[PDB]
Amino acid sequence: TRSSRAGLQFPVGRVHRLLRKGNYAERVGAGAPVYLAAVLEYLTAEILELAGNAARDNKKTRIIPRHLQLAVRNDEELNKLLGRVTIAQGGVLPNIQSVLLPKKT
Amino acid sequence: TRSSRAGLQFPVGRVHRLLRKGNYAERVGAGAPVYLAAVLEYLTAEILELAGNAARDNKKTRIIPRHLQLAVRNDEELNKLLGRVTIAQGGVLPNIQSVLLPKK
Amino acid sequence: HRKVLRDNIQGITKPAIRRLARRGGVKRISGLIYEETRGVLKVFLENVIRDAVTYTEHAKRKTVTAMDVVYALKRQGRTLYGFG
Amino acid sequence: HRKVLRDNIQGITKPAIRRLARRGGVKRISGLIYEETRGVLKVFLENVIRDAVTYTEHAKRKTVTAMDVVYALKRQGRTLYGFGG
Amino acid sequence: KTRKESYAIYVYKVLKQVHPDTGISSKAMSIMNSFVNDVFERIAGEASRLAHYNKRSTITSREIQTAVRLLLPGELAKHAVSEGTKAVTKYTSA
Amino acid sequence: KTRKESYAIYVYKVLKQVHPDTGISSKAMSIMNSFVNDVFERIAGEASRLAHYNKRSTITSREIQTAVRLLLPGELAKHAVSEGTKAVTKYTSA
Amino acid sequence: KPHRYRPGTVALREIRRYQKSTELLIRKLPFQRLVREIAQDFKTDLRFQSSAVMALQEASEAYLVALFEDTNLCAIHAKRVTIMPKDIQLARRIRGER
Amino acid sequence: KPHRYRPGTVALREIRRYQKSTELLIRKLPFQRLVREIAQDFKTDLRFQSSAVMALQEASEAYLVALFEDTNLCAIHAKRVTIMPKDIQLARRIRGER
DNA sequence: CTGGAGAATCCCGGTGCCGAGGCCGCTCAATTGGTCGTAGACAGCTCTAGCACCGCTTAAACGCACGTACGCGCTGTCCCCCGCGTTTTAACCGCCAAGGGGATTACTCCCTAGTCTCCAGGCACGTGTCAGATATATACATCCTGT
DNA sequence: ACAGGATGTATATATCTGACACGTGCCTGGAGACTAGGGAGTAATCCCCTTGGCGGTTAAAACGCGGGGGACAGCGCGTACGTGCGTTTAAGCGGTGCTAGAGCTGTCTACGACCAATTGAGCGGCCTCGGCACCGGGATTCTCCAG
């Protein structure tokens, strides 16, 4: 496969067809979806990696979208890429302002 | 002059080129640049009109970008179309918060 | 084919707005918060489904779908995954 | 040649930050406003210049133009007319 | 030199339609120019995103009607779309 | 049904690469699917207008490198470019 | 002895719960009737897929929740621990609504 | 005979003037050197058109001036008529600038 | 000041069940292999526009005094909202009915890319005014004491 | 609470000067008249998936009732920054010089669509059981009212 011609696990042909069929440029070059499939494989691996670490660290064996919520919102840069994106069944990462915590001794 | 074939004053052919040569669809129908040209002549018309009256209020004859600044920012709808757009050499409307006003 | 409907805005209850605020991390809620909250939710839904119903009208279809409102949410800069 | 420039961040004068506050409709300015003001302006120009340089290395040109940075301001949702495009 | 078009003659013509004995300065002319390029790319872009949903690859005037009825808020959407029907119908009846 | 495309088996494969013995739920799979589509039209559109500015008509890997260096924040840009050049060259060696 | 909990233990403990949980809060049929009622104005006699009603529910709760995040920062910035409606009006103005 | 004014007449009359006028008011050579020195970090040995430095001057005035709009509404919402750096920090978090 | 009800919260254990994961056919989109005009790397000029430099004026920036008013912490005082028992009450759920409208597949056909030539619309390029900045002198509008 | 310096600000009047509205020329992109394959309007059907109703339970909502703590007005006291005047000082100007690189135009060429046969690969139908709920019981921890 062309994924094996590049050593990846993403569809070069399907992504390639999707670059030609959205009217982005009249010509589409030789190795462009190779590069772009590499970038998306890195990003997918990052988010699923952090949801894996949080997936053990909240005692399940299966990634649910809650782990995608606090998986994404804990890295700074993944949050900055996705700062305008709600993800459904995510909820809120636990933030408590300092004046709300009790004034005990 | 397909503007005269439609009764307008905007370039149907130049806009038609710009719809065909920006890779939006694979193909562009007949009536569409007439439509978009009509809409842009409307928007252009009242924005220059509000710059017209709000240009005459500065007693001038030449509209400068200050007149486009408050000419946009006075109407609600033109402001909501352009609420993320800075205008160079525009400045601000005279907004003053009421607690700052000297109230003896 | 004569389905009529009115006054559902009070159906969003006072404890429901309490539950959303406490998901937001809010301790104490004043009295007139609830009516204004119904107003803000009403404005947001008026814009979102005003824009969504136009997507449903352009395909000349009489049924609003999920892709309709996810696309209309995307256009307002409030993109929401998990439906398409 | 190869010139080196050092410490231009204090060139934003305290009266200039006063003047921009006067256009904003700000009456009175506290003490450490100016440090944070130079910091915020520094961050914003760092992002805009970074994206403009990215727009300029891609055409492989040594000179940054104005269409470069109107494009870079457009992409960050801060569109600015009056220089084309 | 290298010719690059604008809208400045056309903006000047609509200015002559509205307040005809009242001129325009050059910075405001270039601001109007980039303004109508901005609205042109918003509406053409919305036509792209709207055609890219219905499995259609053609931008007729009706898609511009819908996309104007999504961008422009309310009243000027009404008169904008009404002038659009005036120009389609005023076009084809000739 | 009409055969809808997805990404779900690929996301499952990268899940097999990172944490090989770990599951994933179905709505999370549709989250990642819409994520991959969202990023895909982001850098696709950035490639569109970024290729439109330079009077070109072709999307090559230099354009995707620039556009990734515009959307990806910093440290996320660098390893994306290292994997990108590794996949271009690793492709090209065959 | 009448037994009670203070003003704040139910609050902060219940903040820990409703931050910690994930599900959708406001009930299905009143919200569904709400979306249909606002939907009748722009066009008569519509139809909804059920998941689209869940979608408007999800974006509507997330927009309100983020609004209470920000109006909470507003009223805390007044050295108050109570949301009041002018704080809501402030955060809506700073986000660029009115 | 001090010939003086209140602390605020020069301020409010100054608000009428600097809201009233439009021109560019951070000096062009220190601003230009500032843009060049920030520009040296990403790549070296640069060249600028002049109007691009004008354009970054417009983004500087628009972003700072709007940040004092929202910062001023922040501090007025504390029943204060004087802005302070925590208010700057508040409006930056509300716009999502962290 | 520090110690017990006791109530909410966390730690194992069987259950179930169903949604996550996997397997078997299988249409079709990737794939491979040639062409082909052409978009674009590539070379070279050009001249123009950005960068460098030097002297002069000076608006603007800098810095010292000063005072008052703005921030802010304490004090009291009220009330609105938090908390919890009690009623109710309408939401949730299962199932049963009906069809209107989405999705599909086909049918037919008008229509919008594509070509080639034809010409004037706009656009580059001199040009010379009338609109505005700039003094320049001149009488109001409101500020600020001091009464 | 009024009156007057004074003082910054609004109101004619010239005046140069130059930025814009305009006239000359041109050339190429708008357009005009054809063709042609295909995208899409349009019909009809399949069925399914939205709507509707009805009964049974009941978690949630409503509501009444303590009560206390959180908003907020007053208020005193500090400090820091706005105001204004003498000092400096480098920014603007304004010309002068030099050449690096944007931009143009031409050269030559490696590369993406066009078809077009070939096929396994991802996808839908269809099983199947193990992980999450999920009661269900039970020790921990934290809070709140006592010392």
Can you walk through the features of this model?
The complex is a heterooctamer, with two copies of chain A, two copies of chain C, two copies of chain E (94 residues) and two copies of chain G (98 residues). Chain A has 105 residues and is mostly helical. Chain A has a single domain, classed as Orthogonal Bundle (Histone, subunit A), CATH 1.10.20. Helices cover 50% and strands 7% of the residues of chain A. Chain A contains five helices and three strands; from the N terminus they run H-H-E-H-E-H-H-E. In chain A, helix 2 (12-20) packs across helix 3 (32-56) and helix 3 (32-56) packs across helix 4. Chain A is elongated and about 70 Å long. By secondary structure, chain C is mainly α. Chain C has helices spanning 14-23, 33-58, 66-75; strands at residues 28-29, 79-81. The longest helix of chain C is centred in the middle third of the chain and has 26 residues, at 33-58. Chain E is globular and about 45 Å long. Chain E is mostly helical and 94 residues long. Chain E starts with 7 loop residues before the first helix and ends with a helix. In chain E, helix 2 crosses helix 3 and helix 3 runs antiparallel to helix 4. Chain E has a single domain, classed as Orthogonal Bundle (Histone, subunit A). Chain G has one domain: Histone, subunit A. In chain G, 65% of the residues lie in helices and 2% in strands. Chains A and F meet through helix 1, helix 2, strand 1, helix 3 and strand 2 of A and helix 1, strand 1, helix 2, strand 2 and helix 3 of F. Strand 1 of chain A pairs parallel with strand 2 of chain F, so a sheet runs across the interface. Chain G binds a DNA duplex (147 and 147 nucleotides) through helix 1 and helix 2. Chain C: The modification N6,N6,N6-trimethyllysine is found at residue 3. Chain C: The modification N6-methylated lysine is found at residue 3. Chain C: The modification Phosphoserine is found at residue 30. Chain C: The modification N6-acetyllysine is found at residues 14, 42, 62, 74. Chain C: Residues 1-3 bind DNA. Chains G, H: GO terms for molecular function: DNA binding; protein heterodimerization activity; structural constituent of chromatin.
Set out the fold topology.
The complex is a heterooctamer, with two copies of chain A, two copies of chain C, two copies of chain E (94 residues) and two copies of chain G (98 residues).
Chain A: H1 2-6, H2 12-20, E1 27-28, H3 32-56, E2 62-63, H4 65-72, H5 76-81, E3 85-87
Chain C: H1 14-23, E1 28-29, H2 33-58, H3 66-75, E2 79-81
Helix pairs in contact in C: 2-3
Chain E: H1 8-18, H2 26-51, E1 58-59, H3 61-71, H4 75-92
Helix pairs in contact in E: 2-3, 3-4
The structure holds a DNA duplex (147 and 147 nucleotides).
